[PDB]
Every structure is written in structure tokens, then in C-alpha cells.
Subunit: 474 residues, 4 copies
């Protein structure tokens, strides 16, 4: 275990209070790590600001080359990154290695290429006797805050576009899951000029707040809870900082009577429980048309019941633990509240596992109504609810009657219906006859309380630049 | 004399407390207008939300047709609009009619065309066996808050793109200058379906806050002060609303030894004093190279001294009054502070005019240093300061060491220097050998405390949509 | 009727040989019109070339305003234009007036808007110390050759984008259908500066050849037959002229077993026979899956048999005559060849109408095989053929094994199949569960022998510009 | 060494007549290579056509990865490639290695990135009840013909975008310079699926004609002479093939009285003579303002006279020989033609060098007039001409009065002038205060007889796709 911070091209020990990092599969401490002191937070931001003078002036080609080298370093170290993430998060090692690592490497390669492909408006004389042109310049110092559910992947989503755009970055991983970020710190120390990338460690109150509130920080990019989002916005209000957030989701899964039910089941067994449901696009809120409602519930219940939980290093393990005791307790609470409703039935699961670590049984709840908390509020655990609906107009309005707006799916064999519904859903992404698939070229980002700004795609790159108009009188 | 609110396709009287509207050229009350009550603010947002169901689904062609009709109505009523704005704001009538009206009409015509020209990423299979496409959908209800310096123009800048994008709008003009917006309410009542456009009137605390804080409002667009900007961001944090903000400027005007001094003088006499300097891009902060400094100051001083102030309806009037008694006092205070500095010389002006109305003399201050308040803080009055500089590296770093980032100009005959400086200035716009020129197709917007988001251009339209990814498994 | 040419802002009589223009509904001559002489063709190109000096430098705003004026003039003369087109082409007057006129007006309004929204690459430093920008400038003089099937529409498709881009145009309508273009000449004479738009009249050999071969012509835009396309390309080879070509089609209409047969029938009754099948996107080549084949043929046969042929000015007329005696002869030949095959059955029609004019009976042929001439070669008449198919892979390969590539449709209720087929069809346009719908913002243009270049959309505008890279060392 | 063709994933000997390849520095034969037989040309195209079925459906990510691997292979083999090109073309080894190789590797890396960043129009409902989307699909089989001046680089410019777009390619290098392409064939054999890339060898008439005329070829990309361009266009007319053409240049270099003369001289000494002037962007046609005309001529004459000719493998060699005996004679004829004029002076050079190889002395001609052949016709040798001019309007009109339109440069210190002239030049590229600089992200391509279509940049990638509109009724 690497445990040093990266500040201005050097690896240094944190000077703040030591913090424990746990293995959620066993509930044991992996190690205690000193967090950044206030002076180190300040030194990180100042180093990034000083490095911006030269970095912000580099060509896209040069930045692309640094991104390609970083992608190669992560690829070369894929096994070690997968092992660390598996130990820190409890993710099944085969999933971390086969799914996450290649996606992370690709994000950096994609953005290396995108850095050189920025669009604009044609230059020309829009006012007689004056030539106008449009540029896209970097902002300056970006503070990035990564969540604990996909520590390395989210670090990549924030680092890649920011750097590609020519900004310098100060990254703060979640205090719960810093291991892969600190390994990255070690490996990436010499790829970019000193201060262009800085990596800190610590809690929101002791490290995150001084970071996001620093006068030299121009943009704050956050993936986390709505509460944390609200706090950051209020905390940066005084300096009008640009913000980029992704705050959570409660993806509606709309299943019509003509859907391939076997495919929906096979799909949700994966998409509602992958990463133990700790995914902002988890297929957690199912709306099933009255005609297939009971068949779907019965078949899905049987499929969810076979999900195998066990050691993350076991190839047969499909379901890992929740990230912490606190999160385990919150998931349990949401389930009990759904049960106290009187009209929700536990089809399978609905209880914590006996034993060490923070495992919760794969759970399916049926009979949930539109206005119930289990349908209106994110749980972020291995829990899926099913609600019956009558018709298309009704279900689209129910799905759109939500505070969330990140992702959604519609399941139907009818061409007309698939396009009608996709056109009307107020969600950043809509999959048809699938769910959960992301690619580096297509944007991912929400609407409403899910936030704003995109991760991945050229739009993700654009978010980290400012458009400028230069007009020459001639 | 129009004084009614536009709510859900009907013209109704405000039900709140009456508020006086002044003629800044005489200091006399033009009339008292009842502001919107709390219930009316709520009714406007609810009508916009209800109208969005259909409006948000219209084609670009249909929206473009509405925008062209509005442009024609404004053009046909050009003289009336120019008279109202001159009476309410004190702008010379000839300027309001010859400069503002055509620009306003053009904003609507431009966005009518832009509504039909939105870019995206090519649709295709980025993941084997899945077709992806990118759409740009509207957000919903937009709350727009217009400032008092260019009431009708800023109303146009907020209405046009929001509507072109398919959103419904609730607009609140400044309590100081509602006349043109209320005339627009009368004229535009039947062009869009009921509830698509709503226009209210009232103070920030009484009407603005209830409006921007409404749960169904998805985006808030503001042009105003930095202080107002911080207040709105804090106010909307709880619901993660999207914001779009232009908050003020202090445009650096960089004059090198090889500039055409006669052109700089003729330029600044207009750009530093137009609209009495109440313009976020006013040429107010001059950095002049030591070689030409004394020559520039003496010639500028003599040119500024001939600016003619008088009745706004007189064709010879070049300089109108400031917007209010309060603003006149603030401007006066900033000048007195500059003078108490001990090292700033008043070349001309520096006093309020005797007589009725809120007139302040066209003022030129010389010897101001980089760290003086007159250089670091927006005055927003008929006041220009000049600071000497030694070299290119020094002055670009000075200019960039600002909390502002809206607009700027550089004056030099050298091709190399013009491009070098333009490339490095941290301002949304940089003019070369001119200043102050805007066109509908080129974006206008800031960086840093000046805010974010663009007015005008296709980027201005894009700011009012959300990018969505639809992916079909096939 | 107007019969004068528009050359350099003047209306002048042709100085060449007189040529007859026929009313295809009666076979009688509407009038004799003198064609442009050699010297007039040359004078038109020289006028366009001289006008380009100033026109090529105008702003988009100015050009947009001229296009809006032209749209207004056509709109105000809608009835007259519809009547001329109906008399010259035999199109049912109600169709010309209700369908064509509004689309024509829209093309001009669309391009007025698009002229101001041209994209490019972001300006910036791609090579250290050098600022690059991308412009889109006009080419110069464009020669446009319009076909006889939609004379005014096609004239608009060529004029609007070329002018919007800043080029000067010399337009030559078909010798068969010049009436609407010569009326346009009259009405549009004063909208653009002298020489910016020129309209000639005459045959391909006497007027078209000297026009397209003029050394000052930079681009030739043609809608016509493959043979004509080949001739023009060979004729312009020596000067490397840019070409833009739409040469014919044979839209495959692929109907799967799960399609809505009643919708297919109702659809094809219109799409296969509108404008008497003289439409490059006519639904003329049906591939019908073996399950629904017999049902489709019988129902389509009955539906096609009720199409009403009669006087163009009678509201109940649905089918007009073919455009010329010669085209009537060619259509009859192709049907007789299909019949001599021995395996093709005439379900309905298959003969010329007795009486005056060039009417051909609405015709449906069944049992056509992939390799038959009726499936492989364009007929451009009121004739539709049906070919049975077994499976998806087979039919997509059949449809793609064609020299044509303009448009296509697929009819199926299955989401997956609709996207799979749409993705693989080698045709510029693919409609799903409809056919024949065009809008000003979406491009229309082919592949393979159908040609290249787009009409309508922003792409249609880009085709009339040249991208330029300006790079300033600094 | 390598002399085999690449056909359908296999390296095979040509079956046609043996052809000699010369070392232009010594005039000796390097070797005899069997060219492709007619059957081999047909097998190459059929292989490409069959590979397209699968290749044309790959994802951009997959194609990008193949391009990155090819870039890596070229980079690793940089020295070998540089040595072959130097031996085959006579280019100074140090220039081929330090300039060409890194640029070639970057073309492939740039397009790997650009393959994943294609733009389109937003998908949505442009017609009520119908969802439209825009795709960019590949064409099919692309025939590429590379010239002899930059064999490998031109091969890369043709291969990279075509492959990135999803097409299969059949490449033919010039008969005089096949060595690098055949080495590439060996190295690239296993990077793409069989038949996706094919490389042939032979003469224009025996190999190039059967290739560009093949019915399955959909696009022909040529860099070569105007005569070859005209022939190809005529040759492919019968099948309406798409063409992409770069046919030669005669770059005007406009030098105003306020230019930095020493920079002009140092620049042209390089740009007028690099690659022995066998460059379509060579700085060969200088227009010098009357004020500095004589000074420029004298200084340039002295600088050009020191250019060192010698063995290509000698690091001190600056100027290599011309490509062939026939090209050397053509260059010598053009010079003699200029001298027979009676008003052109030879400042330096103007004769073939004594000895073996195809060396011609670096030449500067003065007093050339606008209408002289030396000014109007490309020489493509180490020859530069200088013509005096009076004013800006005159010289812009002279420069624009040319059959060429590829590249240009303007030299002046004045901001206004630089932009005015750049705005008006009818050339694909204009450099300001430099010349000859290309980057992978910015397009290179001509207008008029220089051709059309772009190399490099996203536009170069777009040229190899067809835009498609898919519209779903719903
Ligand atoms: Ca969601
Ligand atoms: Ca500013
Ligand atoms: Ca077709
Ligand atoms: Ca050229």
C-alpha cells in the first residue's frame, strides 16, 4: 500500500490526523493514513495554479501524448489496480479486472484523441471589416472530488477531460476509498509537469472544504450525494465558481406488456445488483405494465435469489458487500421503512447477511406505489422495487415526476412506443431493451437534482473550457 | 402606459404593493405600478409548467415561426419601444432607436434560425449491436431576471434562446425599468401559446426570490451584480438548479506604444461613456504603455470633456444620466475614494451635475495603480481610469489578475503582439483595435466572478437544453 | 406568362431559337419561348463573376435578410406559382398549392437561418507560437441545372444554399418546365444585387453545355438522370470543377411479416404514385416478406386501382399525367419489358390512357425478381413492383446490391429489426414505418450512382463553401 | 528489400512486367519489381469489397485501436522508413528522419482519435411524431493513388482517414517511389483484418486505370498532376465515383514593405527549396512590394546560393536531387522558357549540376511578370520567381487570378493588412509571417484546379463518409 500524497511532483506523507481505511468484505482495517493538513491543501492548490502558466499554454498534441502515456501506465498495472480496488471496495475481483480496468484505460485514450478535436464556429467577417474567431481555453485550477463506489473510474472521469482541456487538477478521493488514487499518485508522478496533477486524502470537513473553497480554484467537479452537492454549491457561492455535478439517480425501468420478459430478468439480475446496487444508474425502480407484472415479479424474484455472495477474490462471487457499516445501516433502514408501509411485499432478501463485513441480501420488493419513499428516494443498495402501471401516458408522467434525472430504460418490442417514450423521458440517458451500458464517446450526466454537466464524450471535454470570442478590426 | 403582467395568456394587474418608476433625466415619477403578489408568482410558474407539456414537444420549425413573428412585432413597434426605454432609462432617444432596436430585432431573428441548426454527435454503433443517438431537449421552466441598464435588450437575450430551445419562461425585469417589458407583454400576448411566456414585475425580495426559489423552476438566468449572483446561487443550492450568469465586468483596454492613438481616443470617448458607462463591457480600465501614456491622457481628456449631456429627446445629447439616485451616489463615492488615494489626478469631470436628474460629469482619472480600488472594482458609471505599464508580460499578468473576466481589448499595430495578447487574456471576449462591438452570432459571456454561460450565438441556445443519449439494443 | 431571362439585374428576351413549352394534361402548346443565345450565356456568367467581388464579401446577416425577402415574395405569390406549375407539369393544383408552395417558402427561410450558423474547428495554438483559425468562404460562380419534375422546388434547393453561402448563381431550368423559373426571375429581379442571381432558358446542348463548361464557373449543381450526370462530369473534367449531383433513385421499400399492412398500403398508394411517380424517392421497389406477400399485393392492387386521374384543376384529381410524350413512351416500354419477362403479373393498370395528354394508368406489377430490369432500373412513372423475400439478411443484401443509393424505407413493428436494417442500408435516407417525408433541416442526397452532395440541411449549405485554414505566426 | 504486394492479408509477388526503381542521387537502379497483373488488381478490389461487410460495421473504438497500433509500428521502424525514403527519393536523410517520420506517426495517432469524435445534427422531432437522426457511414472500397514527392506521408494521408471512417482501401504508390509503401505492406499485414488494406505497385495505365475504374470502387483519392486529375475524373465519370483530389499548387508569397525581410529570406531559403521544391506548398511565387523588392531579391539571392547539395546521407546536405531524369528535364525547360522571355534575370542557379543523379542548382529568378509562364504554371523544382507589385488591391487580384488555390502566405507587420489579405485570398491555406507549416488537426486542400477535398483534420475524415438521415415514425 502506497499512502503518500502527490503535491507539486513529489510524494509526501499527509501531515494531518490519521484515518482508518477498511476492507468492507471483512470489516477489518487495511491501514491508517495521515490526511493532508490545511497547509498541504493550500500548497497543492498553489502548485496547481503556478503550473497552469505553462500547462494552460501547451498544444493539444502535447496533452494528448501525456494522456496516452497515463493510459499505458494504468493498463500495465491493471492487475494491481484491480486488486487494490477489490480489497478497498469489496468488488468481485473478476469484475474489477475484466470490466473496470479496460473502461478506465479507454477513458484516457478517448480523451487523448478528443483533446485534438474541439469544435467551434467558423471564423469570418460577421460584422463588416472585422474578423471574428472562437477559441476554447482552459479555466485554471479544477478541484475534483471522487465518490467511493468507483474510486479509480470516477477519478479517471474527472482527471482525463480536465487535463485534456489544459487545466491543472487537485484531486480528492473519498476518505473511505483512497487506495487506488494513492497508487495512481505514485505511478503518475512523472508523467505530467510538477503541479499539473495533485492528489490529496482526507475527509470532507477537513480537506474537501478548504479545497473547494480556495480562491484559486475555478471549478469544482463532484460526484456524490444531493446533500453534498447542496453543500458545495452553497460553499462556493461567494466566488461564483463553475461547478460540475453528478448527484445520484433512481433509474426508472419501464417494462411494457410486449417486452421480452426473460431478457428483462436476465438484465435486471445484473443491472440492479452490480456493485451491490451502489451505482447511480442501477436498474432500481421498475414500472411493469399490469399484463406482465406478476410474471415479471415471480421470474425476477427467482433470478435474484441465486445471486452468489462470497469472498471478492472468488471467481464465483457475483455480489460483494456494501461500502461501510453506515451505508449498510441506511440501506437496511430504507428496506424496513418500505415494509412498514403495509402494502409492500419482500419477494426475496430484505435482511443483512450474518457474518463479518457489510453484506446485504439481494432484495426484491413488490407492490410499491408511485408516492412511496422506496420509489421516490435513492437507496443505493442491492434493492429493486416493482410498481404496476396501466398505460403509456400514465407511466411516462410517473417516471418524469421525480427529483432524479440521470438514466432510464424502456423495454418493449414496438418501434413506435420505444421512440415515443425515449423522446419524452426527462433523463440524461435512455436505453431501449437494455440498461447500464456506457461508452467513452457518449455523454453521461443528469438533469434536475441529479445535477448537470457531462462525464465522457466531447461534451465532457467542453465542460472544462471557456469559449472565447476574439474579434480583429481590420 | 402599459402596466399589466402577462400570466398564462392574460394581461392582469399586479396584486402586490405599488412601486414607483422614475424618469432618471428629471427625477420625477413616471408612475406607480402594482407588483406581482406571491400568489401571482406561483400562478405564473404553474402556468409555465403546464404549458411546457405541449411547448416542449413542438418542432424547431414551429418555434422558429413564433420567434420570427415576435421579431416583426418588435420591429414594427420600434419607435414606441425606443421612446419608453429613453423615458425610463434616460438614454438618448437617437441611440436607443438607431442602435438598440435593430439589435434587439436581430437577436430574435438570429435565434429563430439557430433553433433549427443544433449540432450533436453522429448517431451510430459505438458499442457492437447498439445504435446510439444524441438529442438536445429543453429543461422546462426558465426564470429570467433582467437588469436595468438595457432592459429590453437583456429581456431579448434571455427570452430568445430559452424559447428557441423549447422552454417556457417567466421573466422579471428590474423594478427600476419595467416599462419596455410590460409593453412587450401587451404586444406578445398572443404570439405564443398561453403560459409559454409570462412577464412579472416587482422587487428582488418580494417577487424575484419566490420566483427563482420555486420548485418547478429548472434554470435561473441572471444578468446583474456579483452580490446578486452570489445570493441567487445560495438561494437555489437546495434544489441544484441550473444557473446562467453574467455578473459584471471591468474591461481592460490595453494600449501599446504602436497603437493608433487617435483611434483609441475616438473609440474610448464612445465606449467608456455610452449609456453613461452603465455597460458591463464599458472601456473603463485603460492600461497605457509608458511611451504613449501622457499623449493618450491629454488627448483623451480633451475628447471626453466635449461629451454633451442634455435632454434625452435632443438629437445632440450624447450622455444621459445614471439610472437612479442610489447608483449616482455610489459612482460619486468611488470617484471620491480614488481621489483620497493621493496619487490619482482628475483630468476632467469628477462631479455630479447641478440640476434635476441623476447626471454625473464624464470623468477621466489618471495615475491609477494596479492595486487601487478604481482599477480592481467595477464603477459602472461615466468614469475611465488610466494606468501606466512597462511591458507586454507585465500588463497581461496585470489584466489577468482580476476577479472579472467578461471583455477586453488590445490596441497595437503589430500582428504578432495582437495574437499573443489575445490568446492569453482570460476574458470571454477580446477585441483588437476596437471595442464594444457585438453581433448576434458570436457569444458574449464571462469567466471568474463575471459568471458563466453565454448570451447570443449557438452556444447561447445550447445553454438552455440538456444533451441526452438514447441507445437502442438491436 | 413571363418569358424573359434574368441577366445582370435586367429582364431580357432570349436571342436564340424559339422553343415550345407544353401542357402535359392536354398535349397542347402553352407558348414558344426564345432560348438564351451563346452570347447571353456568356454575359450571364460574366455578370455573376463581376457581382461576386462584392457579394462574396457580404456578411451572413445581409445574405440572410435577402433570403427572407425572397421567401416573402414567393409566399405572397403562392397561388400564381402553384397555377403555373400545375399548368406546366400537370400536377393536381391542390397538391402544388398545399404541399409544394409552403415547402419552397420554408427552404428559403431555413437557409436564411442556417447562413448564420456555420460550424468550424476551435481557433487556437495547435503548433506552439502560431494561432490557427478555420473559415468557410464561397467558391464563386455556381451553375445550377434544375430538372422538370419539381421545377420551382428544385430551383429553390439549388438557389438557397448557394446564395446563403455567398456565391453568385446562374440557373438553368429544364427546357420542358421553365414557367415558374421565369416568373421567379420577374419577381426576384430586384432582391439581390445585379448579377448575383441569373436565370436562363434553353436546351442542354445549346445552353446547358456552354454554361457548365464556362471557365469562370467553379461548381455545377445538377439534379437529373444518370446519363446527364455522366455527361456533365465528363464535360467539366478539363477544369476540375466541383460538382454536386442528385441523379435518380429506386427506393427499396422493405416490408416484413410484422408490418402494419394497412399502413403500408395507404402509404404506398400515395408514395408510389404522387407526382405520377416522377419523384427520385418514389416508393417504387417493394420487397415483401413471403408471409405477407399475397395479402399486400391484393390490398395494394385494390387501393392503387382507385387513384383518380382527371383535370389538374379538379380538387378530386389525385394523379396527373407524365411530363412529356417521350417520357410516356419510356414508361410504357419499361412496363412492356417487364411483361415480356413471362413471370411478372400486372395486378392493375399497365397501359397508357386513351385521350389527350400524357397519362399512364396507375400500375402495380407482382412477381418481379431481384435481377429483372423492373427492379434494377429506374422507371420514374406511376409504376410499383413487388418482389417476395425470405429473410432479413437476404433482403438487406438485395437492396444494397443496386446502383442506386438515395432513399429507402423499412416497415416492421420490431425495434431491433428496424434499427439493424436502418443501420445497414446503403441509402442516403431510411424511413421506418413511413416513406417520402422531407424536412428542410435534414439532408437529402445519395451514394453510388445516385450521386453525392446534399440538398437541404446545414450540410447542403456547407457543400457551397470551401474550408480555409489561416495560421498566424506570433 | 521488400518488394511484395499486400493482397487480402497475404504478401505476394507481382505477376506483371518488371519495372526499375531508381536512386535519384546516383541515377542507378535500386531494383526491378514485378508490378501487379490485371488479375491481381481485380483480386485486390474483390478482397477489399468482401472485407467491407465486417469492417464497415466495426465500432470507432476498434478502428482507432488498429490505427494506434499502426502508428506504433511505423514509429518503431522510423529509421528504416527514413532510410528507404532517402534512398528512393534522394531526400536528405536527416530531414526524412527528423521531419517526415514524426509527422507520419502523428497522422495515424490523430485520426485514431478523430475516428471517435464525429459530429452530426441533434436527433429529435423535426416533423411532429417522427424522430430523426443523422449517421456518418463509410462508403465501401476506396482506391488511393499516392504521388512520388512524399511517398510514405501521402500514403498515410490517404490510408488514415479512409480506414478511420470504416472503409477498406486499395493503395497504389507511384511507380517511381514504391519502396516505403512495400515495407509498410510487410509491417502492416497483420494489423487489420485481411483485405481491409491492400497495397499494389505499377504504372498509371497498367495498374492505376484498372483500379480506379473498377465497378466496386466507390471513391478515388488522388494527389498528382492536373492532367492526371482530369483523366481520373473522365475515367470514372461513367460510374459517378466520388473523387478527392489535390492537384498541384503555385503558392503566392506576398511580401509588403513593412515585412521582416530577414525572416522572409530565412523562410524562403527553406520553404522554396525543401524537397528540392517538389512540394505543392513550396514558396515559389513571390510578389514583393516595390519598396523592398530590390533588397529582398539581393538578400534572397545570397541566401539561396549557399544551399548545400551533396549525398543524401551527409548531415550537411540541404538540397537533394529531383525525382527523375524526365522531371529534371521539365524543370530545366521551364527555366529556359523564363529566360527566353527577355525580361527575367537569373539571380543564382539556373542550370543542371554536373555529375551523376538528377541535381538542379537552387534557382532564383527576378523580374517575372504576372502573365509570364513562370508565374502562371507550376514548376515543382528548386526554382523561385519574384515579381514587383504596387499596392494591396492589385496584388490580391493578381494572386487570385490563378488556376491554383492550395496555399499562400502574406508577410507584413500590420494587423489590419494581415487579416484583410488573409480574408480575401482564394487559397485553401494562408500563413501569416511564415509558410509551409502543417499540423494534423488543420485541413489542407485546394480550390479551382488545385482540386477539392481535404487532407488531415476532422474534415479529412468526413470526406470518407456519407451522411445518412434515419427517420422513425412513432
Ligand atoms: Ca435517474
Ligand atoms: Ca471584464
Ligand atoms: Ca434510391
Ligand atoms: Ca496554390
Amino acid at each position: 500500500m502506497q499512502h503518500k500524497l502527490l503535491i507539486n511532483g513529489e510524494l509526501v506523507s499527509g501531515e494531518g490526523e490519521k484515518q482508518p481505511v477498511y476492507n468492507p468484505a471483512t470489516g477489518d482495517v487495511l491501514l491508517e493514513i495521515a490526511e493532508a493538513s490545511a497547509e498541504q491543501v493550500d500548497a497543492a492548490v498553489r502548485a496547481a495554479d503556478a503550473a497552469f502558466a505553462e500547462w494552460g499554454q501547451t498544444t493539444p498534441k502535447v496533452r494528448a501524448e501525456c494522456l496516452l502515456k497515463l493510459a499505458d501506465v494504468i493498463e500495465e498495472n491493471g492487475q494491481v489496480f484491480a486488486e487494490l480496488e477489490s480489497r478497498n471496495c469489496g468488488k468481485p475481483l473478476h469484475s474489477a479486472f475484466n470490466d473496470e480496468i479496460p473502461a478506465i484505460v479507454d477513458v484516457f485514450r478517448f480523451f487523448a484523441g478528443a483533446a485534438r478535436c474541439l469544435n467551434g464556429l467558423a471564423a469570418g467577417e460577421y460584422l463588416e471589416g472585422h474578423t471574428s474567431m472562437i477559441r476554447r481555453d482552459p479555466l485554471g485550477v479544477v478541484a475534483s472530488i471522487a465518490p467511493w463506489n468507483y474510486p479509480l473510474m470516477m477519478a479517471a472521469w474527472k482527471l482525463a477531460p480536465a487535463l485534456a482541456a489544459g487545466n491543472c487538477v487537485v484531486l480528492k478521493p473519498s476518505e473511505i476509498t483512497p487506495l487506488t488514487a494513492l497508487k495512481l499518485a505514485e505511478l503518475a508522478k512523472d508523467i505530467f509537469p510538477a503541479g499539473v496533477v495533485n492528489i490529496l486524502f482526507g475527509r470532507g470537513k477537513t480537506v474537501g472544504d478548504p479545497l473547494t473553497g480556495h480562491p484559486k480554484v475555478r471549478m469544482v467537479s463532484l460526484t456524490g450525494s444531493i446533500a453534498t452537492g447542496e453543500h458545495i454549491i452553497s460553499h462556493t457561492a461567494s466566488s461564483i465558481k463553475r461547478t460540475h455535478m453528478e448527484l445520484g439517480g433512481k433509474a426508472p425501468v419501464i417494462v411494457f406488456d410486449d417486452a421480452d420478459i426473460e431478457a428483462v430478468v436476465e438484465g435486471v439480475r445484473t443491472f440492479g445488483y452490480y456493485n451491490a446496487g451502489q451505482d447511480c444508474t442501477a436498474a432500481c425502480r421498475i414500472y411493469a405494465q399490469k399484463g406482465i407484472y406478476d410474471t415479471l415479479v415471480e421470474k425476477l424474484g427467482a433470478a435474484v435469489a441465486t445471486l452468489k455472495s462470497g469472498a471478492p477474490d472468488d471467481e464465483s462471487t457475483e455480489l460483494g458487500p456494501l461500502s461501510s457499516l453506515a451505508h449498510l445501516e441506511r440501506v437496511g433502514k430504507a428496506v424496513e421503512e418500505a415494509k412498514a408501509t403495509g402494502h409492500i411485499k419482500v419477494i426475496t432478501g430484505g435482511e443483512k447477511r450474518k457474518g463479518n463485513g457489510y453484506y446485504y441480501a439481494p432484495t426484491l420488493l413488490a407492490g410499491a406505489l408511485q408516492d412511496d419513499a422506496i420509489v421516490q428516494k435513492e437507496v443505493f443498495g442491492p434493492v429493486v422495487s416493482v410498481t404496476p402501471f396501466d398505460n403509456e401516458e400514465q407511466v411516462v408522467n410517473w417516471a418524469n415526476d421525480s427529483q432524479y434525472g440521470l438514466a432510464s430504460s424502456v423495454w418493449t418490442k414496438d418501434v413506435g412506443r420505444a421512440h415515443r417514450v425515449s423522446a419524452r423521458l426527462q433523463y440524461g440517458c435512455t436505453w431501449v431493451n437494455t440498461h447500464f451500458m456506457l461508452v467513452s464517446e457518449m455523454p453521461h450526466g443528469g438533469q434536475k437534482l441529479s445535477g448537470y454537466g457531462k462525464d465522457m464524450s466531447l461534451y465532457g471535454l467542453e465542460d472544462y473550457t471557456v469559449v472565447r470570442h476574439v474579434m480583429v478590426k481590420h
